[PDB]
Structure formats: C-alpha cells, structure tokens
Amino acid sequence: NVVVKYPVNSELANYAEKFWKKELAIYNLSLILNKMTPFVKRRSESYKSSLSAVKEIFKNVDDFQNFLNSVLRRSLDEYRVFFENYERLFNSFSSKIFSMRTKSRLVVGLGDESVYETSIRLHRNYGVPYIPGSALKGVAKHYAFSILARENGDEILRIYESVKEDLKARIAKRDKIKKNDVPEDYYLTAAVIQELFEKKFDELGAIRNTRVEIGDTVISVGDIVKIFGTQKEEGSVIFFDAFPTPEQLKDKPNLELDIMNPHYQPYYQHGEPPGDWHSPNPIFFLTVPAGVEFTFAVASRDLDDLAEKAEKLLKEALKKFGVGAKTSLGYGRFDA
Amino acid sequence: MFEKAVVFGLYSITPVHAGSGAELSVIALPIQRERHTGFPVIWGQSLKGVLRSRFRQLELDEKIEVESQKWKWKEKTKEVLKEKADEFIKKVEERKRDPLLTEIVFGPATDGASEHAGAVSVGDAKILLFPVRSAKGVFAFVTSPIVIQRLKEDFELVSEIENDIELKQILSRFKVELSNNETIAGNALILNGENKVILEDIVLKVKSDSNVIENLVEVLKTLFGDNFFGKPIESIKERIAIVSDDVFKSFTRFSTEIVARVRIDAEKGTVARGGLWYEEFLPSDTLMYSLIAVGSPKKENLPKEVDNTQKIVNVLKVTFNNAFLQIGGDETVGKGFVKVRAGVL
Amino acid sequence: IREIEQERASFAFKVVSDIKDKYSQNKKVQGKYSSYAEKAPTIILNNGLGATLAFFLSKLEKPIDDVDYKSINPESFGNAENIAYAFLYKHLSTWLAEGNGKDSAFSGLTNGEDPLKYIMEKTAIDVAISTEEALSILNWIKKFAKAMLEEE
RNA sequence: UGUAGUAUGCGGUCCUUGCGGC
C-alpha cells in the first residue's frame, strides 16, 4: 500500500529496488543507506525519504533491523582483517589499548546532514559504527574542563578576573543585553577555562602547578595542555578511532532503531500553548545498542606517562561524561 | 646521475589528509591533487619531510640497523669529523643540524645547504588502487588506464636508471581500452546472475578480459611480495576493477571521505559560532606508489658502511619495510596513518 | 575570455539579492534559506544530486517525476521552511538548466530540461559534471547568503 | 641552485513522551 521511488539514475533504480526487496544481496551498508535512498509514499501524497517512512516497506521494525544487521554481517571477514591490521597499527606504536562495553545506547554523528535528517557514523568501506578520534579527544578535553571547573572554579576565576570580565562582556554583547547579570555559575567557569586552554595557554603557566584527581591518578594542568596541545605547541597523545570487536557482530546485532516522539513540538518551536492537541511527529534514527564492545587505543609521542594519563582521563570521560549524541539523556555511556 | 630506485607502497590504514591549503571549496580544506587530472597525489615534499623526520627520530633513538648492526651516530661522527665532532654534536643537541645519516641521505638541515646535496630523491605518491564501495564484494580496488600507463612509464624510468631492460617489459604486455560504461572486474564484484557490477553509484557492464588483471596482480606481487599489507595478494585478485578514465576521475573526486568537525564551547554545550568545518580525506584502504631514487652521496669522507649507493638502498629498505607513518594533518586525532612497504626490482 | 566564475558570482548575487529583497521582513525565511544553502553541499556529496533535489521536492510536498522547476512558485508556500526549500530548489535547478542566461557565457549544462528528469535518464559522467557545477554554484550561493542574509 | 611536511589548536553537538482513545 506504499509506493517506492528512487531518485537515482535509470538502470540502477531496478537494482536498488531489488536490494530493498531482499531479492538480491547487498554487502555495503553505507552504499544501500546513502547512495540508494528510497522515497516512500504512503496514503499521504508525499514521498517522504525519512527512516520513519523508509521502514514502512518492511513488515515491522524488527524486520528492518534484521535486514540492516544482515547487511552489516555480510562483510564480517573483511572487517575482521581490517581490525587485525588496526590492532597491528596499535601495537606498532607504544599505544595503550582498553576495551569497553556500551552501558547504554550510543549514537555518534546524529547531527550530520543527510536525506534521512538523522545520520550515523558508519565506516565507508565496511559500514560498521565507529567513534572518530576527534570525538574522543574532544570529550576528554571537555571532561578535563568540567573537572577543573568543579574543583578549581573560584581559584581560576580569581586568578583570571580579567579573562572572566572579558568573557562576561562578550556574553553581554551577544546574549541579548545582559549588561552585568552574567551569573558566575559553573558554566562561566567552564567557558573561561576553555578560553584559557584554547587562546590563552601561555597565561596558564602559573596554573600549571595545579593538580586534579582523576580516578586513582592525579593530573596536572601542564600535563593536560601537553597532552592536548595549543595553537603553538602540538599535542603529545595520539587519539585513535574506536571500532567494535568483530567477534560480537556474529551473534548480537550491532545496529538498532530508536524513536523520538516530539509532542508539543509547535510549543517548542512556534510558541503555541502546550495543551494536548499536539499530535506527535515520530522520527526514527539508527543507534548501536547497549552492550556492544568497542576497542580504544591512545598512543604517545613524547612520554608514555602522558599516554597513561590520557587513557585514564578518557576512561573516566566515557564512564561519566559520555560520547556521541544526546549525552544529556545517558546515551553513549561505557562500563568496565 | 642516479644509480638505483626503490618503490614505496603506502596503504592508508586510516583516512589520510595531505593538506593543500589552496582556496576552499564546499568541502573545505581540500587534499592535494594533480591540477590537470584531479587525481589525488601526495607531493614529494611532504613525503620526504615525514620520511626525514622518522629517520631523524630513529637515528637519535639509536634504532637504525645498518648491515644488521646498530648505528650510533655520535661515534660515527667522531670517526668522520673528529676535529669538530663535539661542535657538530652540539648543533644536533640544539637542533641546528640533523644527525649524520639523515644529513647524508636527505641532505643537510635548513641551517646550511651549500655543503652538499641529498643522496636521495623521493617521488610523488601517485595513486594506484582506489577503494570504491560495491554492492557485492563489499568494497573494491579500482584502477584506470592512465594509472597503469603511468605505472609503465615509472617502470621504464626505473629500467633506464638501473640499465635493466629485463624489468622494462614486465608490464609492457597490457594494452586496454574501455568505454565509459564498461569495466574489467574480479569475480567477487560481479553480480550473480547478471554480467554487471555496481561501483558505489554506477551499473557497469563487465568487459571480458583476463590478461590485464592477471598481469596487474603479478606486477603488484613482484613489487610488494606475496603479502599485500596484512593479507595475501592472491586474496584480493577478485576484487580489482579497471574502469573508464572519466569514471575513475569521478570516483577520485567525489568518493573521497568528507568529515564534518565542530568545536563545542563549554559556555552552552553547543557548537560555537562558526565552529564547524569540513575536511577532505583519502579513503581508508587506498594504495599510493612512489619512486625513491638514490645516487652517490654528495658528502665527503663517508663511513664505509654507507660508502656506495647500494649501502643506502639496503638501509632504506630495511628501515622502511612494513612500517607505519603519519601523513598530512590531524595526527593527534588518529588520521593519516599509513602502512609503508619498500620494494626493489 | 569569459570565465564561468563571473557568471557563477553574478547569478549567486542576483538570486541572494532577490530573496533578500522579496523577504526583507521575514528574517526567519532568510535564516532558513542560509542554513539550507550551507547544508546542501553536504547532502549532495552524501546522497547525490538527484537525491538532494528529490529531498527538496519532498520537503515541498510535491510529487516527483511530474514536477519541473519552471512550474513552482517559491512564494506560494505558507511555511518558512517550505519557502526556503522552494527558493533553494528553484535557484539550483535554474542554474543547472539555464545558467545565467541564454546570452550569457554559461547557459546551463542541461539545455532546458528539468535537472531531476535529466538526471533520471542520463549517463554517470553527465550527472557527475552536473554535480560539480551544482557544488560550485552552491558554494557561491552560500558565500553570498552568509554575506548579506541574516543568520537564524 | 642547494636545504624545507599546509602543519598545530576544534566533540556533528543542542532541542524533542511511541504516543492519543475503545
């Protein structure tokens, strides 16, 4: 009762429809997802090319998830050799490697622009979910920022009154008028700490003697800035991408669906009173389920002690801060 | 002029961003490419720079194995330049001058260039196989007639340098010509029950030919041994496709990785004002071949272990075989890591 | 010696000035148009040009395979998102199918056919060149939109 | 002419009941 169309060129739409009808066997998940996106028309006169409308061509959500995971599993041998080479690359450097399972659902790259409006970070060649190293480095840096703000908030605020005044003036300039309201909350401390770590690293020389307790170890501010680097000095810790272990993909699914059902969406966007006359607009998106095991590795360029400190910081961040998208809802959390 | 030539093969384990810095298209920070063709290449300057940095690190760490014997640069410099051995060492201690072996091979450091020229000359990392997604055979290694023609020209140059005509005709038995909708693909990529292939956006009729693909596989095997960067070479002979020139150009221009990155400000937890940018990356599992020519060293009073050109050839081959290097930017976030294999004819 | 860069810049300036003048009051329309313009190249590089055009048409609540750019009015939509999507689709398709004009240096790769229907039954090389031209014109349009149009 | 790595610093984030009624 649904009409499927394909905006790809002719002589290829037939093969795309064969792939989506399971008549043929596709092997690359990113290929079928992106380059062969179907446009589904329901009783409503509109070819909505969204996962909510894309799933309508299957029997149910379970069938869609099973099809996606079978397509993912069809490249298991290639992913296995790729992971073996990746582990060899890890061991080539003096990299410390640790494995972590997903405590809750994880979704990285949800904000990427795509036809589905809700994308997911999939490896181009093999079509498996992965965490880019940039995300890990950023989450570690932000966890360090949060720890510093929570512990040494008033101290750094007093030491850098000029910087906090500059930040308050900037906020007043952009955030409405707010001439001097500018509450000195934890968020302002985090902002000025980030500003110090990004544009005012040299002025952070005095603070470098400070130490903050992470997990069981103690990390200095100088250690953190050496690990991450500045505009004038390169970081010393190499953060590699994280990939799931190939073994677990054989038995449990590595990709599932999740739903967002925004009732009162006009209230949030347009300003209508919430009430209850606000029929929802469900939107589905892919996410790797909880329990999937990922392998992380951090290497060093100058000192292995910095690598160990960065590994501890990243473990703490993944345990508490969380990586990926919708981290405010407990998504993308890892457990030992 | 030159004496010998080795072939360096680079297999991109992670996406590689050899930055160019020339303007900014919609995909910001474009990679360096050949202007007239658009094919992605790594210029000799960057490859020589990273090789020189790795060699300097190895020599300072005292890990370079010459003739299966460890190389200590201090005692060698003393045996060569005993009059000023201390002073030159101070320059290395102050980073003014690079260590002895790197200065012999890659030339003297920037602080002084008129003394001698480099004994080595790297080449541009011309692409050989491109990873393109496929319906069957999850991803495929793709090549173009210009690619194999340039490989044959490179082989001819190697034969001329070494005066070895025997290796000249290794690839000289491969002439091809393909329409824009035809390809010579391995059995894995070919669709079941249909003599057609799909390379990430296109349905291509499978042209029937075996000598060309067999010769290409044999050439790769001769260049890089029987181990093709962690997997046997014979295991990928059925995942190779030779496509039309325009199709290969389109693959190299549009199938490259486009990575979006943002900066998260702690004041709000959202992307900052203009904190987002896109970067172009070479896809993972790509092959780039380069020529490294070597002649007589231009220095004076050389040690006996590096006296002749072959003593440099073997040292470079043993020190840069199945190694891992970082090319381009985003080193700190695990980008640009490549497996390097050195071969000779 | 008439470079296509001049035609690209002139067309982008004309279209961005047109949307700025026609909807100077609607700041949210300007913001939506700017966001769609600076996000379109990512969609084109990800899912292709035909998929992007079909996505715009779907966001316009219009059928595919039976709609051309000449038969859509960008101002005939109540919603700001629909307004911006229609304007972007019209501008991109107009540049692809006619260029800056018949007498200009660039007359569009497609003669006069609808770019989506052109993509449907053309070779991969033609759609690749069309994608390259669309990328360039979208880059210019995003540049000019960031220049003049207000930010959402 | 010789010597020379477009590199370092940046989280695709923020916002949303799988519901309403028998």
Q: What are the sequence ranges of the domains in chain C?
A: 1-149
Distances (CA, A) of B117 to B58, B97, B110: 21, 14, 12
Q: Which amino acid is at C85?
A: Y
CA A241 to CA A133: how far, in whole Å? 4
CA B198 to CA B133: how far, in whole Å? 8
CA A168 to CA B282: how far, in whole Å? 42
Residues 6+ apart with CB under 8 A from A273: A267
Q: Is there a contact between B64 and B53 (Cβ–Cβ < 8 Å)?
A: no
Residue A25 token pair: 């066997």
Length reported for chain C? 152
Please report, rounded to whole angstroms, the spatial distance between the CA atom of protein residue B38 and the C1' atom of nucleotide D11: 32
Q: Is the CB of A129 under 7 A from strand D?
A: no
User: Considering only CA atoms, which of A83, A87, A75, A1 is closest in space to residue A32?
Assistant: A75
Beta-carbon separation of B134 and A30 below 8 A: no
Distances (CA, A) of C130 to A99, C115, C142: 46, 9, 18
Q: Which amino acid is at B292?
A: I
Chain B nearest C-alpha distance from A277 (Å): 31
CA B2 to CA A328: how far, in whole Å? 62
End-to-end CA distance of chain B: 19
Beta-carbon separation of A47 and C57 below 8 A: yes
**Entry resolution (Å):** 3.1
End-to-end CA distance of chain A: 47
Beta-carbon separation of C45 and B27 below 8 A: yes
Q: Which amino acid is at C105?
A: A
Distances (CA, A) of B291 to A59, A217, B31, B197, B344: 56, 48, 20, 33, 10
Chain A CB contacts of B251 below 8 Å: none
Q: Is there a contact between B145 and B245 (Cβ–Cβ < 8 Å)?
A: yes
Q: Which residue is nearest to nucleotide D1 (CA to C1')?
A: B114
Q: For residue A216, report the phi and psi dihedrals to the nearest 5 degrees.
A: -110, -15
Q: For residue B2, report the phi and psi dihedrals to the nearest 5 degrees.
A: -75, 165
Chain C CB contacts of A54 below 8 Å: none
Q: For residue C54, report the phi and psi dihedrals to the nearest 5 degrees.
A: -65, -35
Nucleotide in closest CA–C1' contact with A121: D12
User: Considering only CA atoms, which of B112, B113, B99, B16 is closest in space to residue B52?
Assistant: B99
Q: Which CATH superfamily is domain C1-149 in?
A: AF1862-like domain (1.10.520.30)
Beta-carbon separation of C123 and B180 below 8 A: yes
Number of helices (H) and strands (E), helices first, in chain B? 8, 15
Please report, rounded to whole angstroms, the spatial distance between the CA atom of protein residue C101 and the C1' atom of nucleotide D10: 42
Q: Is there a contact between B291 and B154 (Cβ–Cβ < 8 Å)?
A: yes
- What is the DSSP secondary structure assignment for residue B234, as one 8-state letter? G
- Interhelix angle A161-174/A133-159, rounded to 10 degrees, is 110
Q: Is the CB of B195 under 7 A from strand D?
A: no
Beta-carbon separation of A134 and B330 below 8 A: yes
- Interface size, chain A vs chain C, as Cβ–Cβ contacts under 8 Å: 65
Bridge partner list, B184: B242
Q: Which amino acid is at A303?
A: L
CA A271 to CA A293: how far, in whole Å? 43
Chain A nearest C-alpha distance from C39 (Å): 7
Q: For residue C41, report the phi and psi dihedrals to the nearest 5 degrees.
A: -60, -35
CA C26 to CA C113: how far, in whole Å? 32
Q: Is the CB of B260 under 7 A from strand D?
A: yes
A276 touches chain B (CB under 8 A): no
Q: Is there a contact between B141 and B9 (Cβ–Cβ < 8 Å)?
A: no
Q: Is there a contact between A52 and A91 (Cβ–Cβ < 8 Å)?
A: no
Q: For residue A75, report the phi and psi dihedrals to the nearest 5 degrees.
A: -115, 30
Q: Which amino acid is at B48?
A: K
Q: Is there a contact between C11 and C17 (Cβ–Cβ < 8 Å)?
A: no
CA C92 to CA C133: how far, in whole Å? 10
Chain C residues near any Cβ of chain A (below 8 Å): 39, 42-43, 46-48, 50-55, 57-58, 61, 63-65, 116, 119-124, 127
Three-state SS string over chain A comes to: CCEEECCCCCCCHHHHHHHHCCCCCCCCHHHHHHHCCCEEECCCCCEECCHHHHHHHCCCHHHHHHHHHHHHHCCHHHHHHHHHHHHHHHHHCCCEEEEEEECCCECCCCCCCCCCCCCCCECCCCCCECECHHHHHHHHHHHHHHHHHHHHHHHHHHHCHHHHHHHHHHHHHHCCCCCCCCCCCHHHHHHHHHHHHHCCCHHHHHHHHCEEEECCEEEEHHHHHHHHECCCCECCEEECCEEECCCHHHHCCCCEEEEECCCCHHHHHCCCCCCCCCCCCCEEEEEECCCCEEEEEEEECCCHHHHHHHHHHHHHHHHHCCCCCCHHHCCCCEEC
